[PDB]
Each structure stands twice: as C-alpha cells, then as structure tokens.
Design a protein around this ligand. Structure first.
Ligand SMILES: Cc1ccc(N)cc1C(=O)N[C@H](C)c1cccc2ccccc12
Ligand SMILES: [Zn+2]
Ligand SMILES: [Zn+2]
Length: 306
C-alpha cells in the first residue's frame, strides 16, 4: 500500500510546537497516544490532508513534554490535559456575552456557577501562578473565556453539566493565585476563660464561612477581626435571605434552590445594583435574596477594639 505522510505540530502548552510527521494509514492514537484538535479527541482517527500544518495536543509521554507541561499548568496529574481538552471540547460552544462591562457565560450545562465566578474574578485583584491561567484569564477578560472556563473545570475536577459550589471553586483558584502577602489576625474572647488570637496566611486569610457581613466580623460574631492584610475578602455562609446596599460591597453570589441542585446568580455594585444572570441583566437600586457569598475589596485594616 502507498505509504503517505503529512507534517503536524504537537504540544502540551500551545507555546512550544514540536514538528511531527504522521503516517496517514495509522490513527494518531497509534503514534501519539491520546490526541486532540481543539479538544475533540482524535486518538481513534486517522490523519486527513487538512490536518497538515495544524497543532495537536498530546499527553506528556516524554521528558520534554512533562517539563513543558508542569511549567505551564503547575500540575502533574497525568489526567489533567485530557480533562482540560474534554471540557474545552464543550466550553468552546458556549457563548460569552459582554454583560454590564464584563464577560459572562450564557446558561448551558449548569455553568451558572462558572459564570458567577468568572464575573467575580474580573472584579477582584487576582494574580495567578500557573501561566495557563494567567494566559487564559487575560484572553478571558476580552470575551474569549473558552479556555479559562475549561481550565477551571480541570483544576476543580468537575465535568461539564455538573453543578459546583462557587466557594469551593474559588478556593481551588486561590490555591493557584499568589496570595502570600495575605494575612489575617482574629481575636476571640470570653469573660471567664481568656482570649485566643489566631493568625492566618494565604488562602485561609481571605475566606470566611459563617457570616456574610464584613462589618459584623469587625464588631463581633466573641470572635472579631483584629487585623486584615489582603486585596479583598470573601465572606460566605449558607444561603440566607439578605439585603445588599449599593456601595457597601463589590460583588455577591445568590444561590436560589436546594443543596447541589440550585441556581447561582451574581450581583455587582457599580453605579447602581445589577443582577447578572448569565446572559440576562436586571438593574435595581436595592437587592434582597438568597445570598451565600459577599466580596469586599481591601488593602489594610486594623481594629480599634481593645
Ligand atoms: C451547588 C453545590 C454544589 C456542590 C456542593 N457540595 C454544594 C452546593 C450548594 O448547593 N452550595 C450552596 C451555596 C449551599 C452551601 C452550603 C449549605 C447549603 C445549605 C442549603 C442550600 C445550599 C447550600
Ligand atoms: Zn469561656
Ligand atoms: Zn459566637
């Protein structure tokens, strides 16, 4: 049989391309292990004349790719690239409309939690350690968030169509952001026992579960905030009917519904109050509803309590 070939580029990061020659009589799986073309799995398919020149992903089956891959994703999960492509295969069909000055995601495949989280990240100062996330966040800020959402699914071990928790997701991303300058000192007091002062750093320093109001946390829940050093704070608690006031907060997640089967919305404080429901938009001067996460910006705070 006539043995024909084409040339292609393989990569793990789409930053280093490595020219390959493929036998057209064999599937890519017989030459590259698993193989993808914008996420679509091409392991079981044989080369086409049109694939010549095009860039193909591969699993890091050789030391170069392993290095390239860790340097780019900051992970060694042997399944990461696969889960990123499969997700990407899906998130590329999503629409990412600009809603109220920000990138959003039209509802599809239970992505309400990804949308609310993508709106939140555009609004708080976050610097990602993995290049993959740095690169995809920057393209994402410009309405091309298909890769950003697909990497989030793969970093948070979720599959398209499953519902996630906003707070759990953001927690994952925080583990990949550079939040080392972040500190938190708490003081707790009893009139009989004593007082316990905790100090927290990093991810734990910007996240709290039990209250939605920063102001309450500075007065007392007796636990009170003594010092906080962070670009922002995330205040979280199980959904409770709550009232947000223009100007007192940056953003917030509304979780309507039941445990692991509800709907998420994002409220943002700009010149007025806006509800960003995926690709839908309402404005209002006040807002009340089932709120679970409030986000407040910050630089430095020190208490006056003694
Ligand atoms: C969407 C989702 C996916 C995975 C997991 N593990 C949880 C959730 C989820 O529903 N979280 C909301 C905010 C929630 C959190 C905490 C307590 C809650 C009690 C009652 C209702 C909602 C509650
Ligand atoms: Zn006591
Ligand atoms: Zn208490």
């Amino acid at each position: 049989a006539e043995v024909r070939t084409i040339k292609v580029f393989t990569t793990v990061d789409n930053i280093n391309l490595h020219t390959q020659v493929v036998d057209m009589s064999m599937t890519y799986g017989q030459q590259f292990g698993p193989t993808y073309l914008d996420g679509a799995d091409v392991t079981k398919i044989k080369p086409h004349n049109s694939h010549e020149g095009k860039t193909f992903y591969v699993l890091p089956n050789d030391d170069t790719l392993r290095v390239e891959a860790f340097e780019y994703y900051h992970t060694t999960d042997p399944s990461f690239l696969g889960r990123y492509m499969s997700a990407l295969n899906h998130t590329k069909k999503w629409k990412y409309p600009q809603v109220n000055g920000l990138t959003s995601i039209k509802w599809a495949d239970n992505n309400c939690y990804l949308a609310t989280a993508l709106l939140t990240l555009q609004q708080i100062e976050l610097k990602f350690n993995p290049p993959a996330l740095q690169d995809a966040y920057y393209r994402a800020r410009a309405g091309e968030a298909a890769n950003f959402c697909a990497l989030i699914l793969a970093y948070c071990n979720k599959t398209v169509g499953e519902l996630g928790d906003v707070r759990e997701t953001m927690s994952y991303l925080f583990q990949h952001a550079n939040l080392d300058s972040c500190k938190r000192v708490l003081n707790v007091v009893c009139k009989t026992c004593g007082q316990q002062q905790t100090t927290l750093k990093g991810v734990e320093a910007v996240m709290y579960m039990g209250t939605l109001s920063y102001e309450q946390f500075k007065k007392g829940v007796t636990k009170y905030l003594v010092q906080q050093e962070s670009p922002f704070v995330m205040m979280s608690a199980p959904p409770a009917q709550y009232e947000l006031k223009h100007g007192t907060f940056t953003c917030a997640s509304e979780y309507t519904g039941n445990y692991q089967c509800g709907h998420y919305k994002h409220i943002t404080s700009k010149e007025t109050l806006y509800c960003i429901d995926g690709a839908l938009l309402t404005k209002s001067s006040e807002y009340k509803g089932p709120i679970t996460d409030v986000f407040y910006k910050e630089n430095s705070y020190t208490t006056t309590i003694k």
